C-alpha cells in the first residue's frame, strides 16, 4: 500500500483534437498493492478525494510529455493496449522535480517493484 509516486497534477479533456485543462487540480500518485498491481490514481485537491483509480500493468501504458503547447508542464498517458489517451498538467511551481515524477511514473508503470 506504498505510494510509488505522487505529485500535484490536474486532468484535461480531449474533444476531437483539442485538449482543454481542468481547473479541478488534483494529485497524480501511484500505489502498489500487495497483489503487485500498480494503482494509478488521481485525487482532486479540491476535496482531496481519490476521483480516479485504475490498475496499470507493465507496458500497458506510456507516460510522456505533450510537446504541443510549450509553456508549462503537460504530460499524456497513452495505453499501449488500452488504446486510451489521458492528458494531465502539473501544478508544481518548479520543474526541478518534473522529470523525476515523469521518470518515476514510467518506471512505476512499466517497471514495478
Amino acid at each position: 500500500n506504498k505510494y510509488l509516486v505522487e505529485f500535484r497534477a490536474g486532468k484535461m479533456s480531449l474533444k476531437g483534437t483539442t485538449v482543454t485543462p481542468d481547473k479541478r487540480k488534483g494529485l497524480v500518485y501511484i500505489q502498489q498493492t500487495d497483489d503487485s498491481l500498480i494503482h494509478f490514481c488521481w485525487k482532486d485537491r479540491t476535496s482531496g478525494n481519490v476521483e480516479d483509480d485504475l490498475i496499470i500493468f507493465p507496458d500497458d501504458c506510456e507516460f510522456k510529455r505533450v510537446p504541443q503547447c510549450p509553456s508549462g508542464r503537460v504530460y499524456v498517458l497513452k495505453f499501449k493496449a488500452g488504446s486510451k489517451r489521458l492528458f494531465f498538467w502539473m501544478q508544481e511551481p518548479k520543474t526541478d522535480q518534473d522529470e523525476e515524477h515523469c521518470r518515476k511514473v514510467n518506471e512505476y508503470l512499466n517497471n514495478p517493484p
Binding site: 490536474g10 484535461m12 480531449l14 483534437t17 483539442t18 485538449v19 482543454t20 485543462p21 481542468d22 481547473k23 487540480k25 505533450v66 504541443q68 503547447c69 509553456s71 508549462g72 503537460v74 499524456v76 489517451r85 492528458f87 498538467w89 502539473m90 501544478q91 508544481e92 511551481p93
Partner: peptide
C-alpha cells in the same frame, strides 16, 4: 504560491 493551469491547444497523435 501555485502555477496557473495550461491553456487549450490542439493535440495530434504523431
Amino acid at each position: 504560491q501555485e502555477p496557473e493551469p495550461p491553456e487549450p491547444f490542439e493535440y495530434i497523435d504523431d
